[PDB]
Amino acid sequence: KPHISALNAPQLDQRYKNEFTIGAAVEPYQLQNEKDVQMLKRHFNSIVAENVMKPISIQPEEGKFNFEQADRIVKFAKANGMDIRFHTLVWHSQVPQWFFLDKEGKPMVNETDPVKREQNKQLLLKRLETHIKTIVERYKDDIKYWDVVNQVVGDDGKLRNSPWYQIAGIDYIKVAFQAARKYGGDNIKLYMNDYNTEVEPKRTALYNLVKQLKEEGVPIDGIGHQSHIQIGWPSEAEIEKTINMFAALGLDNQITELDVSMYGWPPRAYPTYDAIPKQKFLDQAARYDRLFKLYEKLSDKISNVTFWGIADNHTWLDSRADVYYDANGNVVVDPNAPYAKVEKGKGKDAPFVFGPDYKVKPAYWAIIDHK
Numbered sequence: 001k002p003h004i005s006a007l008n009a010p011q012l013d014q015r016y017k018n019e020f021t022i023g024a025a026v027e028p029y030q031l032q033n034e035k036d037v038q039m040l041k042r043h044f045n046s047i048v049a050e051n052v053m054k055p056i057s058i059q060p061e062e063g064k065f066n067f068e069q070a071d072r073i074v075k076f077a078k079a080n081g082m083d084i085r086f087h088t089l090v091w092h093s094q095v096p097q098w099f100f101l102d103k104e105g106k107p108m109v110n111e112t113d114p115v116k117r118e119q120n121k122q123l124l125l126k127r128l129e130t131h132i133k134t135i136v137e138r139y140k141d142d143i144k145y146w147d148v149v150n151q152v153v154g155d156d157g158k159l160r161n162s163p164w165y166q167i168a169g170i171d172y173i174k175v176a177f178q179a180a181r182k183y184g185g186d187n188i189k190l191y192m193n194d195y196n197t198e199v200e201p202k203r204t205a206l207y208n209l210v211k212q213l214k215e216e217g218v219p220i221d222g223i224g225h226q227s228h229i230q231i232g233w234p235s236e237a238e239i240e241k242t243i244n245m246f247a248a249l250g251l252d253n254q255i256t257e258l259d260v261s262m263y264g265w266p267p268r269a270y271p272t273y274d275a276i277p278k279q280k281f282l283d284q285a286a287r288y289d290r291l292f293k294l295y296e297k298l299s300d301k302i303s304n305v306t307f308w309g310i311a312d313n314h315t316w317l318d319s320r321a322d323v324y325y326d327a328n329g330n331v332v333v334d335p336n337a338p339y340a341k342v343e344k345g346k347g348k349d350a351p352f353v354f355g356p357d358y359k360v361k362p363a364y365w366a367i368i369d370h371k
């Protein structure tokens with residue numbers, strides 16, 4: 001099956017339209033390239049901001065709101081009949097420091113006096129509420145799906161000990177969801193989003209957290225499985241089990257940031273796309289074949305599958321593609337093998353079904369067929 005141009009290959013959203021929407025994460029510069037725009041028009045019916053809807057891009061100083069970049073994404077989505085997801089209202093990263101400073105400009109995490117801690121909790125929760133209110137009041141009629149909180153459970157199975165948590169305890173999660181519902185109404189859908197949702201003890205910790213909150217009347221409609229995964233790991237059986245476990249609680253599932261790295265963890269990457277050997281693309285394509293067969297089987301539990309980019313010329317995975325060089329200056333990709341130095345983030349990953357020159361990959365054929 002040929003490496004033809006994606007711009008006029010059979011539409012990916014159309015193959016899957018009774019199953020689930022098919023989305024892409026974007027940057028605003030992509031809305032001004034002809035190729036990106038035509039790929040979004042051709043192949044996708046859902047969109048998400050890769051960066052410009054994060055807390056620090058929206059409210060970088062208290063009272064200063066930048067919606068110019070977000071607005072452009074919203075406008076392109078509406079003009080082209082796409083669903084929109086909001087990524088994301090609360091995170092422990094790409095968050096502005098001003099949130100966690102007390103009245104005299106000192107870090108709140110440092111405060112020892114207990115009545116002064118409770119004042120900070122309330123102040124931070126008030127700020128959290130205002131940030132959410134302003135965003136939801138603006139977008140509630142345009143944006144149907146919302147990452148309310150991101151990564152709030154650590155990998156050790158305990159609540160992640162972010163400043164949000166150190167300062168305000170578990171109430172920050174509750175206030176985030178309650179605030180989105182109050183200002184957005186009943187028709188927006190509210191998600192908790194995380195990675196390694198398939199992995200113990202995080203999976204069960206995630207599960208117990210959401211069940212508890214739902215029991216307490218905290219509004220949560222679903223789980224966002226980021227799905228930054230590899231060719232082998234995690235297995236499909238464990239994905240399937242994960243999806244089913246959350247669906248048992250009456251939660252929707254979205255696959256919110258799908259990419260299939262060519263590498264392991266910590267990754268040892270090739271320095272260029274051209275160096276990646278052909279067999280890696282065939283392996284990837286069988287992984288995607290199994291993957292999307294599983295998504296289809298569970299289509300009644302999954303409303304959306306979104307890829308964390310458009311085509312292989314641009315992916316955040318390249319920021320993790322460390323290249324390992326042995327003493328002779330040759331590239332080392334075997335995980336236990338000798339090496340002398342590493343150039344962090346200088347290599348090239350290849351995670352999507354569309355290549356860097358916008359032609360279809362074997363993984364595409366594997367997910368467009370009905371075999």
Ligand SMILES: O[C@@H]1[C@@H](O)[C@H](O[C@@H]2CO[C@@H](O[C@@H]3CO[C@@H](O[C@@H]4CO[C@@H](O)[C@H](O)[C@H]4O)[C@H](O)[C@H]3O)[C@H](O)[C@H]2O)OC[C@H]1O
Pocket residue numbers: 050051087150195196226228265316
């Ligand atoms: O077991 C391994 C994990 O440790 C490992 O780590 C995490 C993967 O998920 C990440 O969170 C996602 C990452 O993408 C964010 O957007 C990017 C943030 O920075 C920008 O510069 C870039 O353009 C964005 O695309 C997204 O918002 C966020 O929700 C997390 O940070 C990693 O530690 O994954 C692999 C496992 O094997």
Ligand SMILES: [Cl-]
Pocket residue numbers: 013040041042043044045
């Ligand atoms: Cl479309």
Ligand SMILES: [Zn+2]
Pocket residue numbers: 011013014042044045
């Ligand atoms: Zn369409």
Ligand SMILES: [Zn+2]
Pocket residue numbers: 273274356
């Ligand atoms: Zn090339």
Ligand SMILES: [Zn+2]
Pocket residue numbers: 018019020299300301302303304
């Ligand atoms: Zn569905």
Ligand SMILES: [Zn+2]
Pocket residue numbers: 027050314315316
């Ligand atoms: Zn990017």
Ligand SMILES: [Zn+2]
Pocket residue numbers: 289365366367368369370371
């Ligand atoms: Zn297939």
